[PDB]
């Protein structure tokens, strides 16, 4: 009964910890995504520099 209530609170803290893990994973995924759009964006830029160099040459 009392230990059961303590266990409900412990389960609550456990799902809170799971959500915290999900959130640190969200941050990891978000920085990985940001790195990836940065890579795509700068790749587009290098393509622009390259074709401009050929045109001017």
């Amino acid at each position: 009964s009392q230990t059961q209530g303590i266990q409900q609170l412990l389960q609550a803290e456990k799902r809170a910890a799971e959500k915290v893990a999900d959130a640190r994973k969200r941050k990891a995924r978000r920085l990985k995504q940001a790195k990836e759009e940065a890579q795509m964006e700068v790749e587009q830029y290098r393509r622009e520099r390259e074709q401009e160099f050929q045109s001017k040459q």
Binding site: S1, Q2, G5, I6
Partner: protein, 49 residues
């Protein structure tokens, strides 16, 4: 606002009290909260009494 589970315990065949020496049995009925403000306020009141 007592809200948490009642922990009950009892000691018979006591020992004389540390600061007066009264040979008095002991019994405890606790409800202890997990908030910090309560942990300090109740600590103050309980150590006071």
């Amino acid at each position: 606002r007592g809200n948490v589970f009642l922990r009950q315990a009892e000691i018979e065949n006591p020992l004389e009290d540390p600061v007066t020496g009264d040979y008095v049995h002991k019994s405890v009925f606790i409800i202890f909260f997990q908030g910090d403000q309560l942990k300090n306020r109740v600590k103050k009141i309980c150590e006071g009494f």
